[PDB]
Curated annotation (Swiss-Prot), chain A:
Shown residues in whole-protein numbering: 175 to 810 of 810
Entry note about domains: Contains 5 N-terminal periplasmic polypeptide transport-associated (POTRA) domains which interact with other subunits of the complex, may recruit substrates from the periplasm into the outer membrane and also act as a chaperone. The C-terminal region forms a discontinuous 16-stranded beta-barrel transmembrane region. The central pore is ellipsoid, and probably closed by extracellular loop 6, perhaps with the aid of other loops.
Lineage of producing organism: Bacteria, Pseudomonadati, Pseudomonadota, Gammaproteobacteria, Enterobacterales
Family: Belongs to the BamA family.
Organism, scientific name: Escherichia coli (strain K12)
Chief subcellular location: membrane
Effect recorded for D290L: Very minor growth defect
Membrane-traversing stretches: 251-259, 262-272, 281-288, 292-301, 310-321, 331-332, 349-361, 390-403, 417-426, 435-445, 455-465, 535-544, 559-571, 594-603, 605-615, 630-634
Effect of G410C: No effect. Lethal
Effect of E626L: Very minor growth defect. Lethal
Impact after mutating R192E: Severely impairs cell growth, wild-type protein levels
Subunit field text: Part of the Bam complex, which is composed of the outer membrane protein BamA, and four lipoproteins BamB, BamC, BamD and BamE. BamA interacts directly with BamB and the BamCDE subcomplex. The Bam complex has the shape of a hat, with the BamA beta-barrel crown in the outer membrane and the periplasmic brim formed by the BamA POTRA domains and the 4 lipoproteins.
Curated annotation (Swiss-Prot), chain B:
Lineage: superkingdom: Bacteria
Function summary: Part of the outer membrane protein assembly complex (Bam), which is involved in assembly and insertion of beta-barrel proteins into the outer membrane. Nonessential member of the complex that stabilizes the interaction between the essential proteins BamA and BamD. Efficient substrate folding and insertion into the outer membrane requires all 5 subunits.
Protein name as it appears in the record: Outer membrane protein assembly factor BamC
Shown residues within the full chain: 29 to 84 of 344
Organism of provenance: Escherichia coli (strain K12)
Cellular compartment(s): Cell outer membrane
UniProtKB/Swiss-Prot annotation, chain C:
Parent-record interval covered: 29 to 111 of 113
Keywords: Cell outer membrane, Lipoprotein, Membrane, Palmitate, Signal
Record's keyword annotation contains Signal: yes
Gene that encodes the chain: bamE
Membrane protein topology class: Lipid-anchor
Source organism of the structure: Escherichia coli (strain K12)
Sample GO molecular function, one term: protein-macromolecule adaptor activity
Protein name, as recorded: Outer membrane protein assembly factor BamE
An example Gene Ontology CC term for this record: Bam protein complex
Similarity remark: Belongs to the BamE family.
Swiss-Prot record, chain E:
PROSITE patterns: PROKAR_LIPOPROTEIN
Protein name, per record: Outer membrane protein assembly factor BamD
Protein source organism: Escherichia coli (strain K12)
Domains: entry comment: The N-terminal may interact with various proteins as a chaperone to assist in the folding and insertion of proteins into the outer membrane. The C-terminal region may serve as the link between BamA, BamC and BamE.
CDD domains listed in its UniProt record: BamD
Length: 636, 56, 83, 367, 213, 236
C-alpha cells in the first residue's frame, strides 16, 4: 500500500510540500525514476515525525507540539492516509544561557561554550550541538558520562526564551582492563593496535567508540560491539570488552584448466588477510599460461612499530612472450623484490617510501623510438633485427608516495575525496638513471542532500624523464586509454605511435605482422595504431552522476549511472618526430584526445563491474576509437 | 585437522612447563593469590597421557 | 603516532586537598580508586598522571601516597617532574 | 476490497430497459483514485456538486450547465495557495452548501451567490458528510471530534471529544438526525448519540466485538451513517457487528454480524447493505435472516445501495452501474455511462438519480 | 530394529572409526529424542563427536546429558570430557585455525577448560582421569599466564607503562608460579623505570635477582 | 576468419546456460554476475521469481560483454528473458539478445541479433535425481564482416543429473549428451558436432567449493578439443 496524502494541518506561515521533502516517506513521485520508500513502513513514519519536530524547533518555535498522528486506512487497502495534527507558537529569540550544576571548576571553558549572541532566533539543533560540545570538554577530563539535560524557560511576556543546561559531571572512571574476547583465530595485538582507549588510562566514552570504529576498519572481523562493564569494587573502575566474531579471513583459490590445442591455464591465489592470526596480510598468487606468466608473493605487515609505521614488500616474476594489441610484442623475462615502509603523520595523510629492485631481461624488440633512445644511451647496438635488440639490466629505485583519503561512503562515495601520488627516483646500484612523478585525484561533491546528484571531478597527470645521460626506460612509460583514464579508446592506444624502422625479422613466420618491416614487404617508415606510451600523461574528466534508472527501491546506492566528458593526451618529452612524413610530434604536447559518453557501474559479486558506451569525436592522430568499453573491478 | 588418534588437538601437556613458586627478599612480600588458580593435590592415582582410556 | 594517555587523572586543586590526617577511604573518594599500587609489602598507592601526546614528550606527576599498615595517614611525596 | 481475490466473475445480464446517459460535466479536476466521501446534493432541481480540487461547479438537474464556478482557497495560503482538498461532501440546506475539506475548513457557499461565503476551522480535518439539523452543521472529523457550526456565520460551536485509536480504518461515519439526536459512528467503533444542544449526552456504546491484534478496532470501525427506522438505529462496523440499538436506551443491543464500510441505506423492511466481501444483500429489518443475496458481484468497490425507480443502484470501479432487483436478488440491467469507475456515492433524491465519477463527471440517469 | 542398530553401532564404534558411529547413534535418536533410551545413546554420542572433530556438537551433548539427568555414575567422565572438548577448542583442531598454539588468542575457552578440569580434580580425586586432568591444568595455567604475558609484551611496544604494571601485578596475583610470570618479570622492571619513581623498578629487580629465570 | 564464428558459438552456449545453472541448484538471484572463460565473457543481470497458481513465472534482464584474444573479437549486448516452470513439469525458456560487435583484424563494427529458446520437462525419477529431455533452436542474423548469413543451429539432447547431499555439503553432478546440427548458414564453424559434457559443482559447508567441468564437441566437423576446467575455493 502506497502513501496517498501527507496532510500537515494547522500550519502557520509554512507550506506542506516542503515538509514532505525532508520525510523518509513521501506521498508522491514528483520526478522521474526516483522511487525510494513507497512501501509503507511503521519505523519510517515514526522517523518522519522526529524530523518534523526538529524542523520547527530550528525555525524558532519552542511551543511546537504534535497533538496526534491519525493513520487511517482506505477500505480498499490500496491507500494510506497520513494526517499530522500540529500546533505551533510564536517566534522566540535566545537571549542567554545559564549553565547550572557541577562544572568542578571547569566553568571557564564550559560556560565559555554554549553561548548564544543576543537576538538570534531559537534553534533546536543549536542546543544539541552545544550539549555535545559540553560533553567533549568533559570527557577529556575523564568524566566520560556527564548528564547534560537541557529544557528551556519560556517567556511569552517579551516573546523570548532563555535556556537552562543542567551539567552534572560525575567522578572519574579509570579503565582497568581492555579484554578481547571472541578472537577465535586472531591474536590480541591485532585488536589492541587498533585502539585509542589505552588500558589503565582515564576512560573516554568517545575514545572507546573511536577504537570500535577501527575494529570495523580492519575488515577481519564481521561484527564488533563494545561492552562497558563495571568491575566489582567502585564504579570508578571498568573493563571495556569487545565481543568480535571472526570472519572467513583466508582463501585458497586454485583454478586449473586444459584448453583447446593443448593449452593450459593455471591460476592460483592464496590470500590470508589475517595471516598466522598476527593480522598481517600475506599471500602468494600467480597464473601460468602459454600467453603470459606472472607470479607475485606479497608480505604486508601493517602497524609494525609503535607509531604504526608499516612494513611490506613483494617478491615477483613478470614473464611473457608477447604483449597483445595496442602494445609492442617483445619477450620479457623479469623478476624483482620491493620492500616498502609506510609512515602515518596524520589520520588522513599517509606517506610511504621504499626500495624497489627489478631486473628486466628484454629481447625480441621491434624497432621503435622509445626503445631506440634507451638502447642508444647505454651504447648497446640498435639493430634492424630483434635478436640484436637483446639486453639485460638491473634497475634499482627509491620509491615514494603520498595519500590523502577522506572518502565518505567508501563503496559508493557521494562526498569526500582522495589524492593518490606515486613516484620513483633512481638510486645508484642501478644501471638506469631516471625520475618520475605521477598522481591521480578524485573529488566527489554532493549538489543536494539526497546524495543522488553528485558532481565528480577526476584528473590524472604524470611526468618523468631520463636522468643524466641515461634516457627514460621504455618499460617505465606512462599510458592512457580505458575506464580509469580516457574511455572510449582502446586500452593503452593513447600516446607515441611505433614509427617503424624497417624491421628485419630474424624469425619471420608466414605473414608475421611487424607492420612497416623489411621482412613483411615494406621498406619505408610508417606509424601504427599501437602506442608505446610517452613519459608524460594527462587525463581530465568531469562526471556528473544521475540518480538511478530503477523505480525499484533495491538498486539505489548499489548502482550509479553517470554522463561524462573525458579529455587527455600522452606525449614523450624527448622524441624523434623527424621520422615520418606527416608524423604528429610528441616532443612538445600533442593534440588532445576527447571522448564523451554514458556509463553504468554496478556493484557485483565479481567486484565492481563497469560498462560504458562512448565515442571519441574523431580518431585523433590515428587512435583506435571504440563504440563500447567494458572493464572488470574498476573501482568508484 | 592433523590431530592425534588418542586425543583430538595437538597435545603439549607432556611438554608442559614445571611450576615453581617465586622467592623475594624480606621487605618484598609477593602478592597473595586472587581467585582460584591453585593446582589441587591428588591423593588418588591413574594411568597418564595416552595410556589413559577415555572410553565412556 | 597514537595519543598515549595513561595513569590516573589528577586535577591540580584536587591534589591540593590531600593533607596528612586523611584516611585511605577518604583519598579513594576524592581522587577515585588509584588503579595502581605496590604489590610488595604494604600498600603504596601511586597516582601517576602520565601524558604523551605523540607530538610532545612526557608530563609525569607522580603522587606517591603511602598509607603504611595503619591506613590512617598519608605521607605526601609529590614529584611533578617529567621522566 | 480483497487483494487475494481480484477480478471476480463479472456479472452478466441482458438489458430489460436501456438507461439514459446524460451530461458528463467534469466538475473540478477529479478525485482520482484518492478515496473521499463526496456526492451530489440537489435542491430545486439544481445540483450542487464539487471535487477534490477546490472547484465547486454548480449544475442543473436536467441539463448541467448553470455553473457558478467557485474556487475555495481561503486559509490555504500559509506560504503558497494550495487547493482545498474538498472531502466533506456536498449537502444543501438553507441555501448554504456545506462542503468540508481536508484542510480542516468547513466551507459554506451560498446558492444565490457562491461568492459570499464563510469558513470555520474545525478541529482535525473534515471527512464525514456535513449533515445539518437543528440549525447546527454537524461534521465528525478524522481526529475523532464532533464540531457543530452555526447555520449562518458559524459563530456558535461545541466541541465533543470521541475516542479514536489513531491507527484505525478510514471512510467516515457521519452524524444522523434521529429525533434530534446526532447518532454518529466512532473511529474506535463506539457508536455515540449526542443530543444536539451544546454538546450534551456524551455517551458511547461499543458495537465492535472484533478481536485480534490490529483487528480489534483497527480494522473494525464504523464508517457507515447509522439509519433510524422504527426508532432503532443500525450501525455497521467493517468487521461484522450489525448492532441494532434502540434510541430509547441504546445500551440494549442485540447482534447478527454482517460487514460494510460504504454507508448503507435502510429502505422499506429490507436492510440493503453491501457486505464484507462486497456481497449485496437485503436482510430482514428486525430479523437477521437474509431475504435475498447477490454474491456474483463479488469484488469491485461498491457504492451506496440507493433506491431509484424500484431498483437498487450500486456502482463498481469499472463504471458499470448495476441495477439489482429488490425481490429476488438478481440483476436487471448493467451499463457503463463512463469508462472510469465510481468511488463516490450516488444520490436518489428529487426523484432523480445522480452519481459522480472518478474523472469528476456527474451524470443524471433517468430510469 | 533399535537393538540391531545398537548392535552395529558398537561394531562400527569399536571395529570401525568414530567418524561412522555417528550415523548409527543419530538413527537411534531419530526414533526417540530423549524418550525411551534417554541420553544413553547421546552419551556414546559425546565420545563420537569428540573423536570425529566436531567439538561444538560434543559440548552441546554434554549439556544435554547433565540437565535431563542431573547426577550420573559416570559423572567422573562428564567433568573430564567437557574440559577436554574445551581444551581441544584451544588447540588447533577445527576449521580456521592456523597451527598457532601461541597462547595469545582467546581467554574464554581456556578459562572454561581450567574451570572444568579443576572441578574434576577437587570433585573426584579417586578417579583415573584425575592425574591426567592435573597435568592438563598445569599446561593450561601456562597458557593463561602466557596470555597476560602477551598483553604486557605488546604494552611495552605501545609504550603504555601503566598497562604493563597492572598486567604483571595481575600475573603475580593469578599465576604466582608459572614460568611465563618469570619471563614477564624484567618487563615489569622496565615499565616502572620509565616512570619517575625508579624506586619501584628496583624492588621488582630484586625479585628477578631472587632465583626465578 | 573463424574467430568471430567461435565467439558466436561460445555466446550461443552462454545464452541458456544461465537458466541451466538455476535448475542445477547453483543459480544465484538478484545481481548475479558470472564469468565464463582465449575467451572471457562477462554476464551480469538481475532476475526475480513469482510463486503463482498454475505456473511459477520468472522474468529477468541481463547485460553482457564478450571478448576473445588470440587478433581479437568483442561484443556488448543487452538481453531479456522469461522462463516458466509449469505445474505439469513442462518448462520452457524464452530468451533474446540484441548484440553490437566490434572486431579488430583494421576495425569492423556491425550490429547483429539472435534469439533462442529451449524447452524440456523436469521429470523426476527420484527427488534427488532428475532426467531433463530438452530441445533447442537458436536463430539469429549476422551481417557478414564474408557472405551475409542467418545462422540457424539447433540441438536436441537429454541431460541427466544426480545430487548427493548431506548436512552442509552438496555435490551436484550433471552430464548432458546433445546432438547439434546446422540447418542454415550461407556464409566458418558449422554445427554438426556432438557435445559431451560432464560436470560436478560441489559445495562443502559454506565458501568452500570444488567446481569441475569437461566439455568436448567432437564427432563432426571443426571439432573442439578437451575444454577441461576445475575451480577450487577454500576458507579458513
Amino acid at each position: 500500500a502506497e502513501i496517498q496524502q501527507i496532510n500537515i494541518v494547522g500550519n502557520h506561515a509554512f507550506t506542506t510540500d516542503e515538509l514532505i521533502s525532508h520525510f523518509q516517506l513521501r506521498d508522491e513521485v514528483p520526478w522521474w525514476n526516483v522511487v525510494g520508500d513507497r512501501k509503507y513502513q511503521k519505523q519510517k513514519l515514526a522517523g518522519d515525525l522526529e524530523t518534523l519536530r526538529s524542523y520547527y524547533l530550528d525555525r524558532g518555535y519552542a511551543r511546537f507540539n504534535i497533538d496526534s498522528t491519525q493513520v487511517s486506512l482506505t477500505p480498499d487497502k490500496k491507500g494510506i492516509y497520513v494526517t499530522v495534527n500540529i500546533t505551533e507558537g510564536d517566534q522566540y529569540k535566545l537571549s542567554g544561557v545559564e549553565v547550572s550544576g557541577n562544572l568542578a571548576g571547569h566553568s571557564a571553558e564550559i560556560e565559555q561554550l554554549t553561548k548564544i549572541e543576543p537576538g538570534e532566533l531559537y534553534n533546536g539543533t543549536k542546543v544539541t550541538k552545544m550539549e555535545d560540545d559540553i560533553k567533549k570538554l568533559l570527557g577529556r577530563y575523564g568524566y566520560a558520562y556527564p548528564r547534560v539535560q537541557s529544557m528551556p524557560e519560556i517567556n511569552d511576556a517579551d516573546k523570548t526564551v532563555k535556556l537552562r543546561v543542567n551539567v552534572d559531571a560525575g567522578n572519574r572512571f579509570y579503565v582497568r582492563k581492555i579484554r578481547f574476547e571472541g578472537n577465535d583465530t586472531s591474536k590480541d595485538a591485532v585488536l589492541r593496535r587498533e585502539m585509542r582507549q589505552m588500558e589503565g588510562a582515564w576512560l573516554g566514552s568517545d575514545l572507546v567508540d573511536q577504537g570500535k570504529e577501527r575494529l570495523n576498519r580492519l575488515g577481519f572481523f564481521e561484527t564488533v560491539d563494545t561492552d562497558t562493564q563495571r568491575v566489582p569494587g567502585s564504579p570508578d573502575q571498568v573493563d571495556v570488552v569487545y565481543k568480535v566474531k571472526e570472519r572467513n579471513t583466508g582463501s585458497f583459490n586454485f583454478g586449473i584448466c586444459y584448453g583447446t590445442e593443448s593449452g593450459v591455464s593455471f591460476q592460483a591465489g592464496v590470500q590470508q588477510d589475517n595471516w598466522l592470526g598476527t593480522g598481517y596480510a600475506v599471500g602468494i598468487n600467480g597464473t601460468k599460461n602459454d600467453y603470459q606468466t606472472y607470479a607475485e608473493l606479497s608480505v604486508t605487515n601493517p602497524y609494525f612499530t609503535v607509531d604504526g609505521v608499516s612494513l611490506g614488500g613483494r617478491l615477483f616474476y613478470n614473464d611473457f612472450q608477447a604483449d597483445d594489441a595496442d602494445l609492442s610484442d617483445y619477450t620479457n623475462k623479469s623478476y624483482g623484490t620491493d620492500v616498502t615502509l609506510g609512515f602515518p603523520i596524520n589520520e588522513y595523510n599517509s606517506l610511504r617510501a621504499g626500495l624497489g629492485y627489478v631486473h628486466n631481461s628484454l629481447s625480441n624488440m621491434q624497432p621503435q623510438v622509445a626503445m631506440w633512445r634507451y638502447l642508444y644511451s647505454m651504447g648497446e647496438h640498435p639493430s634492424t633485427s630483434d635478436q640484436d635488440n637483446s639486453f639485460k639490466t638491473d634497475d634499482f629505485t627509491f620509491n615514494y608516495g603520498w595519500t590523502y583519503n577522506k572518502l565518505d561512503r567508501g563503496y559508493f562515495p557521494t562526498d569526500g575525496s582522495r589524492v593518490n601520488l606515486t613516484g620513483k627516483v633512481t638510486i645508484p646500484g642501478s644501471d638506469n638513471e631516471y625520475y618520475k612523478v605521477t598522481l591521480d585525484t578524485a573529488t566527489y561533491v554532493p549538489i543536494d542532500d539526497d546524495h543522488k546528484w553528485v558532481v565528480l571531478g577526476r584528473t590524472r597527470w604524470g611526468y618523468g624523464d631520463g636522468l643524466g645521460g641515461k634516457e627514460m626506460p621504455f618499460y617505465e612509460n606512462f599510458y592512457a586509454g580505458g575506464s580509469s583514464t580516457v574511455r572510449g579508446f582502446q586500452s593503452n592506444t593513447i600516446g607515441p605511435k611505433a614509427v617503424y624502422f624497417p624491421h628485419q625479422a630474424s624469425n619471420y613466420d608466414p605473414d608475421y605482422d611487424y607492420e612497416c618491416a623489411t621482412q613483411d614487404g615494406a621498406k619505408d617508415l610508417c606509424k601504427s595504431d599501437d602506442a608505446v606510451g610517452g613519459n608524460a600523461m594527462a587525463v581530465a574528466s568531469l562526471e556528473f552522476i544521475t540518480p538511478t534508472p530503477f523505480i525499484s527501491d533495491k538498486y539505489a546506492n548499489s548502482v550509479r549511472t553517470s554522463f561524462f566528458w573525458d579529455m587527455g593526451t600522452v606525449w614523450d618529452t624527448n622524441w624523434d618526430s623527424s621520422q615520418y612524413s606527416g608524423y604528429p610530434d610528441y616532443s612538445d604536447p600533442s593534440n588532445i584526445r576527447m571522448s564523451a559518453g554514458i556509463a553504468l557501474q554496478w556493484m557485483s559479486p565479481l567486484g565492481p563491474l563497469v560498462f560504458s558506451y562512448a565515442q571519441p569525436f574523431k580518431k585523433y592522430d590515428g587512435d583506435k576509437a571504440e563504440q563500447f568499453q567494458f572493464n572488470i573491478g574498476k573501482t568508484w | 585437522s592433523r590431530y592425534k588418534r588418542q586425543v583430538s588437538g595437538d597435545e603439549a601437556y607432556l611438554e608442559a612447563a614445571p611450576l615453581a613458586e617465586l622467592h623475594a627478599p624480606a621487605g618484598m612480600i609477593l602478592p597473595v593469590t586472587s581467585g582460584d588458580y591453585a593446582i589441587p593435590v591428588t591423593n588418588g592415582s591413574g594411568a597418564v597421557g595416552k595410556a589413559l582410556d577415555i572410553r565412556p | 603516532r597514537p595519543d598515549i594517555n595513561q595513569g590516573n587523572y589528577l586535577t591540580a586543586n584536587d591534589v591540593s586537598k590531600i593533607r596528612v590526617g586523611m584516611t585511605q577511604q577518604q583519598v579513594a573518594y576524592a581522587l577515585g580508586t588509584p588503579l595502581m599500587s605496590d604489590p610488595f609489602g604494604t600498600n603504596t598507592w601511586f597516582y601517576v598522571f602520565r601524558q604523551q601526546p605523540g607530538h610532545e614528550g612526557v608530563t609525569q606527576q607522580t603522587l606517591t601516597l603511602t598509607f603504611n599498615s595503619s591506613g590512617v595517614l598519608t605521607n605526601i611525596d609529590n614529584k611533578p617532574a617529567l621522566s | 476490497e480483497e487483494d487475494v481475490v481480484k477480478m471476480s466473475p463479472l456479472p452478466t445480464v441482458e438489458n430489460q430497459f436501456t438507461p439514459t446517459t446524460a451530461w458528463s460535466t467534469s466538475v473540478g479536476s477529479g478525485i482520482g483514485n484518492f478515496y473521499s466521501n463526496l456526492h451530489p446534493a440537489l435542491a430545486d432541481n439544481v445540483v450542487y456538486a464539487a471535487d477534490r480540487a477546490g472547484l465547486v461547479k454548480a449544475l442543473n438537474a436536467d441539463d448541467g450547465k448553470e455553473i457558478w464556478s467557485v474556487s475555495l482557497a481561503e486559509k490555504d495560503g500559509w506560504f503558497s495557495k494550495e487547493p482545498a482538498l474538498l472531502s466533506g461532501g456536498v449537502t444543501v440546506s438553507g441555501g448554504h452548501v456545506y462542503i468540508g475539506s481536508e484542510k480542516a475548513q468547513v466551507y459554506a457557499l451560498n446558492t444565490s451567490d457562491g461568492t459570499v461565503a464563510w469558513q470555520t476551522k474545525v478541529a482535525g480535518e473534515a471527512l464525514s458528510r456535513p449533515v445539518v439539523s437543528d440549525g447546527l452543521v454537524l461534521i465528525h472529523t478524522s481526529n475523532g471530534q464532533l464540531q457543530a457550526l452555526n447555520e449562518a456565520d458559524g459563530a456558535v460551536k461545541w466541541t465533543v471529544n470521541l475516542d479514536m485509536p489513531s491507527l484505525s480504518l478510514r471512510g467516515e461515519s457521519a452524524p444522523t438526525t434521529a429525533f434530534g439526536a446526532a447518532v454518529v459512528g466512532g473511529d474506535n467503533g463506539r457508536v455515540s448519540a449526542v443530543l444536539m444542544e451544546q454538546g450534551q449526552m456524551i455517551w458511547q456504546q461499543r458495537i465492535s466485538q472484533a478481536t485480534g491484534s490490529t483487528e480489534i478496532d483497527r480494522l473494525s470501525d464504523v464508517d457507515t451513517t447509522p439509519v433510524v427506522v422504527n426508532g432503532v438505529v443500525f450501525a455497521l462496523a467493517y468487521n461484522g457487528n450489525l448492532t441494532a440499538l434502540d434510541l430509547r436506551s441504546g445500551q440494549i443491543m442485540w447482534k447478527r454480524e454482517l460487514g460494510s464500510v460504504n454507508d448503507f441505506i435502510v429502505d422499506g423492511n429490507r436492510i440493503y447493505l453491501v457486505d464484507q466481501n462486497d456481497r449485496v444483500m437485503a436482510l430482514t429489518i428486525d430479523g437477521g435472516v437474509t431475504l435475498w443475496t447477490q454474491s456474483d458481484l463479488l469484488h469491485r468497490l461498491l457504492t451506496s445501495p440507493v433506491l431509484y425507480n424500484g431498483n437498487l443502484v450500486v456502482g463498481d470501479s469499472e463504471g458499470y452501474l448495476h441495477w439489482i432487483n429488490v425481490e429476488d436478488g438478481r440483476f436487471v440491467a448493467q451499463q457503463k455511462v463512463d469508462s472510469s469507475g465510481f468511488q463516490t456515492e450516488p444520490v436518489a433524491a428529487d426523484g432523480k438519480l445522480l452519481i459522480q465519477a472518478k474523472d469528476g463527471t456527474v451524470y443524471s440517469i433517468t430510469r | 530394529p533399535p537393538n540391531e542398530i545398537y548392535a552395529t553401532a558398537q561394531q562400527k564404534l569399536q571395529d570401525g572409526n568414530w567418524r561412522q558411529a555417528i550415523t548409527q547413534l543419530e538413527a537411534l535418536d531419530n526414533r526417540y529424542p530423549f524418550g525411551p533410551y534417554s541420553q544413553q545413546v547421546q552419551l556414546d554420542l559425546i565420545y563420537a563427536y569428540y573423536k570425529n572433530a566436531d567439538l561444538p556438537l560434543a559440548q552441546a551433548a554434554i549439556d544435554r546429558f547433565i540437565r535431563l539427568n542431573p547426577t550420573h555414575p559416570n559423572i567422573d567422565y562428564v567433568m573430564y570430557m567437557r574440559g577436554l572438548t574445551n581444551m581441544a577448542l584451544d588447540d588447533s583442531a577445527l576449521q580456521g585455525f592456523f597451527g598457532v598454539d601461541r597462547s595469545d588468542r582467546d581467554p574464554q575457552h581456556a578459562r572454561a577448560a581450567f574451570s572444568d578440569f579443576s572441578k574434576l580434580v577437587r570433585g573426584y580425586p579417586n578417579s583415573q582421569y584425575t592425574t591426567d586432568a592435573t597435568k592438563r591444568l598445569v599446561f593450561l595455567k601456562d597458557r593463561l599466564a602466557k596470555y597476560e604475558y602477551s598483553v604486557a609484551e605488546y604494552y611495552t611496544e605501545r609504550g603504555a607503562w601503566v598497562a604493563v604494571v597492572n598486567r604483571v601485578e595481575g600475573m603475580l596475583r593469578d599465576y604466582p608460579d608459572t614460568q611465563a610470570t618469570r619471563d614477564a618479570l624484567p618487563l615489569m622492571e622496565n615499565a616502572y623505570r620509565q616512570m619517575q619513581m625508579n624506586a619501584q623498578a628496583e624492588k621488582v629487580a630484586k625479585i628477578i635477582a631472587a632465583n626465578s629465570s | 576468419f573463424s574467430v568471430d564464428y567461435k565467439a558466436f558459438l561460445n555466446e550461443v552456449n552462454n545464452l541458456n546456460k544461465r537458466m541451466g545453472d538455476l535448475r542445477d541448484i547453483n543459480g544465484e538471484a538478484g545481481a548475479w554476475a558470472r564469468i565464463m572463460s582465449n575467451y572471457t565473457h562477462v554476464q551480469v543481470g538481475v532476475d526475480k521469481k513469482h510463486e503463482l497458481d498454475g505456473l511459477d513465472l520468472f522474468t529477468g534482464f541481463t547485460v553482457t560483454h564478450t571478448d576473445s584474444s588470440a587478433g581479437k573479437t568483442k561484443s556488448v549486448g543487452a538481453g531479456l528473458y522469461a522462463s516458466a516452470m509449469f505445474d505439469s513439469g513442462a518448462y520452457i525458456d524464452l530468451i533474446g539478445k540484441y548484440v553490437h560487435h566490434d572486431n579488430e583484424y583494421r576495425d569492423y563494427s556491425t550490429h547483429s541479433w539472435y534469439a533462442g529458446a529451449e524447452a524440456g520437462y523436469r521429470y523426476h525419477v527420484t527427488e534427488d535425481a532428475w532426467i531433463e529431455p530438452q530441445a533447442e533452436l537458436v536463430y539469429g542474423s549476422v551481417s557478414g564482416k564474408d557472405k551475409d548469413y542467418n545462422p540457424l543451429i539447433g540441438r536436441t539432447g537429454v541431460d541427466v543429473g544426480k545430487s548427493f547431499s548431506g548436512k552442509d555439503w552438496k555435490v551436484t553432478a550433471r552430464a548432458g549428451l546433445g546432438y547439434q546440427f546446422d540447418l542454415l548458414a550461407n556464409g566458418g564453424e558449422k554445427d554438426s558436432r556432438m557435445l559431451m559434457s560432464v560436470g560436478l559443482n560441489a559445495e562443502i559447508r559454506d565458501n568452500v567449493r570444488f567446481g569441475l567441468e569437461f566439455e568436448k564437441s567432437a564427432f563432426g566437423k571443426y571439432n573442439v578439443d578437451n575444454a577441461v576446467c576445475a575451480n577450487f575455493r577454500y576458507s579458513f
